[PDB]
Ligand binder design. Structure first.
Ligand SMILES: *Cc1cc2c(cc1C)nc1c(=O)[nH]c(=O)nc-1n2C[C@H](O)[C@H](O)[C@H](O)COP(=O)(O)OP(=O)(O)OC[C@H]1O[C@@H](n2cnc3c(N)ncnc32)[C@H](O)[C@@H]1O
Ligand SMILES: *Cc1cc2c(cc1C)nc1c(=O)[nH]c(=O)nc-1n2C[C@H](O)[C@H](O)[C@H](O)COP(=O)(O)OP(=O)(O)OC[C@H]1O[C@@H](n2cnc3c(N)ncnc32)[C@H](O)[C@@H]1O
Ligand SMILES: CN[C@@H]1CCc2ccccc21
Ligand SMILES: CN[C@@H]1CCc2ccccc21
Lengths: 499, 494
């Protein structure tokens, strides 16, 4: 019934918020809709897989908050396999390579690729992480889709195709679905193109031994009966001295403050008294989550390694159900597996099939890409279609269609009376990720601590010491990468020398 | 507690569905979230205005279902004043005109304008009303915004500006916010550019004497205590023999079937057991409603008529809070008023101001456009910002951002077990309008009648006889309008 703070949602963000408040001496309750904590993280355990992350999994350098929280909870990481060669599969053929980026040999195509990534980061530098709507060209950039921007920037089909895959992979949405401003913000707030796309020295460097679900689970262990499972929140009433929070199973909770730690649009599942202010009322109808099926195919051995392939495949083309894979073999070298994502429209297209039908399509694809008949002999399969989840709405995160971030963005984490807003979507660094979940949950918690007069204003936002275990190498560029002209840039130089 | 059909939502669509089912002999209950019926229609009554529609108001030729339903309920229409000249205000200057379209005098600009409207209708002819995702170029058109399409088609800034206003007015959203496929469908399913934009012989021809709210009110009168006000639905359970519907005020309703007659996205406010299928689960997060403040400024007399202006103003430019007005004077000639819409981003921008501040801005604008100091002397003001409504989400209707209609459109009115879907968004003719609300409510009702084996399949969708009171004149084009080249077309010939 009565407490200091009700946290709506027991994902990483809600759990991090609850833990901070609990550690500060406040009485907290976490109201979680599902029969489990973890939300967009979910670690399945069975005999065949031991454990497998079916939701959020990867962590890496510069994600210091999630690393610190997990370490405190007694968790360890291991490195995703990137020892052997990566594969870029394009136009039905595989091209092995090393480094974060597939090599480009054609001089013109090379200039185009180089310019595209450079320009993405150039534009990102103009976008404040904590206020993307303050970018000098915010309106101009927000009013076009990523598709339009790619059409403008990419003078080769090769660059456009790879850029498209990049967008699909980063935000589980189509290039025509998302605002260019929002996407450029999203990449910049993850530290840029190299950081977001890299395994070694990037977002995909590591996984947690035993699964990421342990973060939420171990916080639940700490909080005991303060976490209430199968309590979907239906109603929040702020008309009286204490906030009243009602659940679907007819329980009433009374609190001084509330943290909403659910995906922004899932705020729609709550009836508000008094009604939300106009901007938030409409905002929460304008912010969908992406579409993805995460699929893990198990094999007797990590046979790709014997062919000097690490298991990473970047697979272009409409026919391919999966556009991106990583080796998901255990650190011990057993439970050999390939993780792949079925992205955006393909998640919707292929959801119609049976589990067995999807497994067959994936194996046949992997056999082709890896040039290996062994890929046709899986020993086990697990998958999760996040599009079907009532209490997630999708994965990985919320995307902003054209025009929305500038018009409604400022309200995303603006308190509504005594309701404060956590959730990865409200983070300013690695929003969309487990890292962003921690940042947002702890920030929301400290907003309440400040409201209670327990901490000064300048302690609401808190820096994080760099992990000693996962140090971050800086992102570097070469002289040629910095100064080589774009395709139209080269054409100008040809135009002027001819004149 | 127990009934045949629970209808969620007591707007026109829910009420029309409930009435049909009731008239067929079924026991119906309407669960309405608000303390009133009508939803996106709302007629305010007070001494100063007598009555005023603050939500949906206009009806016109080809909207035969709403006209028939209203007539049966004892309502009458009157004609919106369009006797005198319309005004197009552009680059700070007023240009009076007659007919539905503001004239263009520059020859190149004429070709560009002519081509734009023609092309909109040309494209629409390839879009099936009942299945826009089956258009031959559905994906190509769905993957671009209306902004991109206008940028492609309009060789003049004049055409682009007017086209932008047209989009803003029709769907209370920015050109860059909406799918081209969806917008082209929207116009086509209202009978095309001329029909949707016209007062005389179009969607804005008429209003209901006494207000459109009377439609929902009078059906509530018929249904008696079957309508439950302040019963927001929170939970629908289909795991057992009978469907269980729970409200926020802790009441339980048991039914054989349910009609969801709420805006698609407002389905999010209901927790479902079992969960919705994947496609609907995501669809209802991808379909926002537009943004609008409807504002009515009252005056001692309809003074604009004395200057041979009817009260219609089409006002271009960022500075103008209101881009479109109509005379809102009563048929009797009293309660003189100008109705104006604050559209899309301007609704969001100007919501910050006070009611009095908005009144001042509107009066000063109207004084400029009408060239009359009398506009500065209002006697009364009413307004409604639909963006603030928890149980509407916006107005007039739901828009589809790029990529959504093709990927999710087919699921909009697909039944989910024993839940059938009404609401204007699911109509195939005048979706977005009161007309569409009636079409969808009655169709959803008849889907259930068919499910019960009471009517054959071919009776689910039913034609509507043309109103004798509001006959439709056909939409015509001239030889030159049909065959004059576009700007690039002329450049080819050169
Ligand atoms: C789905 C997914 C996510 C993901 C990814 C791959 C997939 C398939 N890969 C990631 C990765 O490799 N590395 C990474 O850092 N992130 C990755 N992501 C995203 C990541 O999982 C999320 O960013 C993160 O988990 C989000 O955490 P957050 O706490 O902000 O949000 P949540 O997990 O969705 O938690 C919300 C909880 O609230 C409950 N809920 C929802 N509605 C209610 C109501 N009405 N009442 C009470 N509780 C509610 C949900 O059940 C959930 O537990
Ligand atoms: C807002 C608006 C609309 C409008 C317009 C101008 C404005 C400012 N001008 C119009 C016009 O001139 N001519 C015309 O034909 N239409 C015009 N529109 C649109 C028109 O008002 C709508 O198309 C029509 O009213 C829609 O009717 P429909 O029945 O489909 O939808 P609704 O009115 O929104 O009714 C829904 C009801 O459901 C209730 N609700 C919502 N959630 C719940 C829950 N969870 N439980 C129970 N009830 C719920 C709403 O309260 C509402 O009453
Ligand atoms: C949340 N991060 C997603 C999850 C996997 C991945 C891979 C490359 C870039 C981004 C991502
Ligand atoms: C719902 N119809 C809207 C409401 C008023 C109007 C005017 C022109 C075109 C469309 C519209």
């Amino acid at each position: 019934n009565k407490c200091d703070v009700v946290v709506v949602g027991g994902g990483i963000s809600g759990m991090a918020a609850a833990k901070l408040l609990h550690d500060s001496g406040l009485n907290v309750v976490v109201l979680e809709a599902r029969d489990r904590v973890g939300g967009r993280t979910y670690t399945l355990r069975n005999q065949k897989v031991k454990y497998v992350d079916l939701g959020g999994s990867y962590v890496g350098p510069t994600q210091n908050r999630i690393l610190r929280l997990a370490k405190e909870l007694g968790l360890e990481t291991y490195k995703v396999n990137e020892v052997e060669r990566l594969i870029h599969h394009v136009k039905g053929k595989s091209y092995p390579f090393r480094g974060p980026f597939p090599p480009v040999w054609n001089p013109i195509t090379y200039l185009d690729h180089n310019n595209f990534w450079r320009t993405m980061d150039d534009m990102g530098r103009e976008i404040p992480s904590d206020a993307p709507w303050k970018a000098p060209l915010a309106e101009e950039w927000d009013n076009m889709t990523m598709k339009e921007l790619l059409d403008k920037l990419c003078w080769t089909e090769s660059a456009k195709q790879l850029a498209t895959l990049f967008v699909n992979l980063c935000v589980t949405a189509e290039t025509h679905e998302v605002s260019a401003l929002w996407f450029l913000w999203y990449v910049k707030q993850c530290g840029g193109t190299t950081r977001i796309i890299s395994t070694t020295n990037g977002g995909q460097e590591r996984k947690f031994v035993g699964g990421s679900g342990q973060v939420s689970e171990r916080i639940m262990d700490l909080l005991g009966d303060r976490v209430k499972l199968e309590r979907p929140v239906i109603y929040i009433d702020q008309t009286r001295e204490n906030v009243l929070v009602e659940t679907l199973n007819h329980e009433m909770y009374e609190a001084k403050y509330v943290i909403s730690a659910i995906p922004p649009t899932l705020g729609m599942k709550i009836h508000f008294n008094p009604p939300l202010p106009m901007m938030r009322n409409q905002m929460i109808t304008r912010v969908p989550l992406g579409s993805v099926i995460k699929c893990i195919v198990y094999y007797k051995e990590p046979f790709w390694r014997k062919k000097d392939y690490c298991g990473t495949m970047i697979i272009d083309g409409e026919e391919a159900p999966v556009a991106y894979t990583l080796d998901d073999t255990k650190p011990e070298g057993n439970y050999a597996a390939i993780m792949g994502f079925i992205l955006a429209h393909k998640a919707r297209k292929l959801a119609r099939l049976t589990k067995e039908e999807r497994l067959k399509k994936l194996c046949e694809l992997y056999a082709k890409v890896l040039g290996s008949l062994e890929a046709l002999e899986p020993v086990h399969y697990e998958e999760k279609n996040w599009c079907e989840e009532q209490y997630s709405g999708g994965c990985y995160t919320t995307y902003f269609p054209p025009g929305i971030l500038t018009q409604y963005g400022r309200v995303l984490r603006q308190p509504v009376d005594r309701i404060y807003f956590a959730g990865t979507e409200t983070a300013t660094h690695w929003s969309g990720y487990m890292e962003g979940a921690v940042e947002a949950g702890e920030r929301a918690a400290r907003e309440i601590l400040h409201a209670m007069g327990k901490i000064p204003e300048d302690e609401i936002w808190q820096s994080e010491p760099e992990s000693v275990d996962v140090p971050a190498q800086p992102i570097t560029t070469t002289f040629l990468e910095r100064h080589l002209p774009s395709v139209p840039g080269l054409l100008r130089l040809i135009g002027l020398t001819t004149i």
